[PDB]
């Protein structure tokens, strides 16, 4: 049995959101690496970050539409969900809301805590932290602890803010 | 203290299996046949995950066949894998393809390294 | 920034055959004595010293052929770009020159593989 | 050049410890204790063991070399890049105190080990016959040591007693060699 094998050897974090949301950018921030050479993710990135006495294994899966049917393949053994939204791209709020809804009804993601990053706040096109919350109907969620954190992956603002929530809920 | 001793024997039996040809050659075949798609880059392709699923199935199959033939039940197998002896009676080299079943990071590294090695041999051969 | 080019130059060398083939030939020739046991043999250390001399000769030739002086090389190896532009797989035989533990694992693993292949062939 | 290559390491955090002393002193037993590993099938070491232990911010790489006379001419192959010397004595084996003192003296005179901090473990203190660390230090004239820091620590590798006390001293002196 495969699960028995893991005792021969720890937090798995699933990072999802639409294409261009800033997921990879955030991940390289978390990993303290150079940002300048980030391209659209055609598959997925993993990086492990040491914080809070935890090993954070963060899976950044590409958000283009053609990749979204593969999301299901990364649901198993998820401990935290981090969902990223481009807060300046209002015309995609419906699309990202529907992905988030499908994620929150997913069996394999039954009771996983979810953090929502209202990204790209550096830009003042960005909608307030939670003009976005609802429109997304986040106060209606009921079998799960959640949070929304205004942030900015470019420069770093509020990322640590959200990351602290992510792991009081481990 | 006696089934403690029996668990030590199970630890040894597993180590023997993981060094043997019934486990090692199918693992070797799989790695050599499926690594060509594994590029030495940070970003992973979706196809890596699908190949990992195939690897997981092979690993489960090899282990079930072993447990059945030798006659070791899963509870016992669990006790042996949790034992600290499992790490010290089996080398890191021997344990690697086992840990790769649950740990994709180890799996990718294994596959990427083999691809590098096979591409190198293909290049040297190209003209002697 | 000239350091970034040096980093990529080094990574290109470590991916190339000028480096990789002499390294592969040493490892394949010498690994048979590396048993997969915890305790190491005194002979492993002499073989590691031979490995060091090979790696040093290889790096020294490359640097002089291309025109990179030792302090440029040190600057590049010290840059964080070194770790991001070169993978752990490509770095492994490099780090094995300094780190015996990495060296032994490399030899033990190749020895296991060569034996497995020998078995498969007669099987 | 080869020393430049260590900068390519993840956190070049790493401490190289050389563990020496006569055969039967308890070196391998100590090593396995440090690594929290089973000691039940330890045999005389014909070559050497290496164990990496995470302790108080450092990765300690401990090199355990066999202490039989036939192996001691190889000790010097392990001197270069030593950050810390741990020297182990069987405190109960008084008949071999002169032999072990002579090995320590030669080590402390060795050019390749100059300025290296040395921890002397007075091992097997679980034995009633064990001589006190105080008596061993006096016998080895340890006070006369110059040009390096040193420490002697009573321990039993078999029980684990005193081992962490010695290793706490080691971790405070990871840089004594370089600062000197
Ligand atoms: N203004 C601003 N731009 C950002 C921010 N985060 C990312 N970007 C920019 O938006 C683009 C997309 O970032 P990226 O991290 O690639 O997004 P992604 O979610 O990983 N995309 P995909 O899922 O397709 O791979 C890049 O040009 C990036 O620099 C942010 O907080 N503010
Ligand atoms: N009572 C007692 N016995 C000990 C202690 N440490 C080691 N021994 C015993 O002394 C013997 C020698 O142990 P060992 O670890 O092999 O010594 P060594 O220094 O590695 N020998 P070598 O250098 O030849 O390999 C073993 O029987 C071991 O169990 C200790 O603290 N107390
Ligand atoms: Mg991306
Ligand atoms: Mg020994």
């Amino acid at each position: 049995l495969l699960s028995i094998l893991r005792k021969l050897k720890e937090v798995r974090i699933l990072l999802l959101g639409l294409d261009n949301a800033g997921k990879t950018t955030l991940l390289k921030q978390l990993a303290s690496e150079d940002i300048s050479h980030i391209t659209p993710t055609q598959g997925f990135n993993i990086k492990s970050v040491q914080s809070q006495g935890f090993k954070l294994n963060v899976w950044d899966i590409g958000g283009q539409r053609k990749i979204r049917p593969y999301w299901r393949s990364y649901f198993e053994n998820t401990d935290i969900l981090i969902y990223v939204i481009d807060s300046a791209d209002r015309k995609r709020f419906e699309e990202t809301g529907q992905e988030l809804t499908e994620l929150l009804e997913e069996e394999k993601l039954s009771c996983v805590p979810v953090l929502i990053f209202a990204n790209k706040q550096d830009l003042l096109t960005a909608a307030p932290a939670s003009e976005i919350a609802e429109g997304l109907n986040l106060h209606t969620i009921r079998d799960r602890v959640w949070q929304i954190q205004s942030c900015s992956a470019l420069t770093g603002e509020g990322v640590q803010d959200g990351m602290n929530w992510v792991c009081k809920n481990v | 203290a006696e089934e403690e001793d029996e668990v030590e024997w199970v630890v040894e039996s597993i180590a023997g299996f993981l060094r043997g040809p019934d486990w090692s050659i199918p693992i070797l075949d799989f790695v050599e046949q499926k690594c060509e798609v594994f590029d030495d880059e940070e970003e992973s392709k979706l196809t890596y995950t699908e190949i990992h699923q195939e690897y997981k199935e092979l690993v489960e199959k090899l282990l079930e066949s072993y447990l059945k033939e030798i006659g070791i039940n899963e509870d016992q197998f669990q006790e042996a894998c949790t034992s600290p002896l499992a790490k010290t009676r089996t080398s890191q080299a021997i344990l690697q393809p086992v840990l790769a079943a649950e740990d994709f990071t180890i799996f990718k590294a294994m596959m990427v390294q083999k691809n590098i090695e096979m591409q190198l041999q293909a290049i040297r051969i190209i003209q002697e």
Side-chain angles (χ1 to χ4, degrees), chain A residues 122-142:
Chain A
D122 63 307
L123 203 197
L124 61 81
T125 315
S130 311
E131 170 191 332
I132 296 175
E134 335 284 13
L136 243 181
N137 301 326
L138 295 172
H139 57 278
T140 59
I141 319 179
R142 136 171 186 171

Side-chain angles (χ1 to χ4, degrees), chain A residues 24-146:
Chain A
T24 307
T25 297
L26 167 69
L27 172 83
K28 288 227 173 238
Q29 286 289 69
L30 297 183
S32 311
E33 304 183 11
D34 173 18
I35 291 182
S36 61
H37 294 84
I38 294 174
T39 205
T41 318
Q42 308 304 326
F44 63 97
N45 301 294
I46 304 172
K47 266 177 193 308
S48 293
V49 185
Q50 290 299 328
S51 295
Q52 340 183 37
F54 295 129
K55 188 169 188 190
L56 299 189
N57 294 325
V58 192
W59 295 56
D60 155 38
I61 308 84
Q64 283 172 87
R65 267 112 90 130
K66 62 171 184 155
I67 303 174
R68 288 178 212 168
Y70 290 85
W71 284 8
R72 293 182 183 277
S73 292
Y74 303 91
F75 287 172
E76 222 61 75
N77 297 320
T78 301
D79 291 307
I80 298 296
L81 173 63
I82 301 190
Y83 196 78
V84 184
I85 300 166
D86 188 343
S87 303
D89 206 337
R90 299 170 186 270
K91 305 310 288 195
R92 303 237 273 154
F93 282 177
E94 220 55 51
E95 184 181 353
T96 194
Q98 220 38 61
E99 302 294 348
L100 179 50
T101 305
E102 293 178 352
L103 285 173
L104 295 173
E105 297 175 14
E106 268 293 342
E107 22 188 352
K108 288 182 294 296
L109 302 175
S110 36
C111 326
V112 180
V114 51
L115 168 72
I116 298 89
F117 269 141
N119 195 40
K120 309 210 191 184
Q121 288 289 340
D122 63 307
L123 203 197
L124 61 81
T125 315
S130 311
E131 170 191 332
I132 296 175
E134 335 284 13
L136 243 181
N137 301 326
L138 295 172
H139 57 278
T140 59
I141 319 179
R142 136 171 186 171
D143 292 74
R144 159 189 301 116
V145 175
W146 68 273

Side-chain angles (χ1 to χ4, degrees), chain B residues 15-62:
Chain B
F17 175 62
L18 297 178
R19 296 186 219 105
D22 296 319
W23 162 264
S24 302
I25 295 186
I27 295 297
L28 175 61
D29 283 331
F30 183 99
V31 168
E32 290 185 341
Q33 300 172 347
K34 304 280 183 175
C35 68
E36 88 218 339
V37 86
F38 284 78
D39 299 328
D40 187 22
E41 314 197 347
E42 182 172 85
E43 184 175 310
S44 291
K45 314 171 179 169
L46 299 169
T47 52
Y48 294 178
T49 303
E50 303 174 329
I51 296 175
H52 194 213
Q53 272 300 144
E54 294 183 66
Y55 180 79
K56 286 219 210 56
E57 282 165 21
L58 170 64
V59 164
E60 182 179 29
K61 201 239 295 169
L62 295 180

Side-chain angles (χ1 to χ4, degrees), chain B residues 74-109:
Chain B
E74 278 183 6
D75 278 9
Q76 257 186 308
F77 178 73
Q78 173 154 343
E79 289 183 275
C81 291
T82 79
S83 171
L85 291 174
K87 301 164 170 73
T88 67
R89 299 285 175 91
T90 82
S91 63
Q92 292 278 301
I94 286 309
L95 262 196
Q96 183 205 33
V98 176
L99 296 173
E102 59 264 37
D103 188 324
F104 175 79
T105 291
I106 289 173
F107 175 73
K108 174 179 174 184

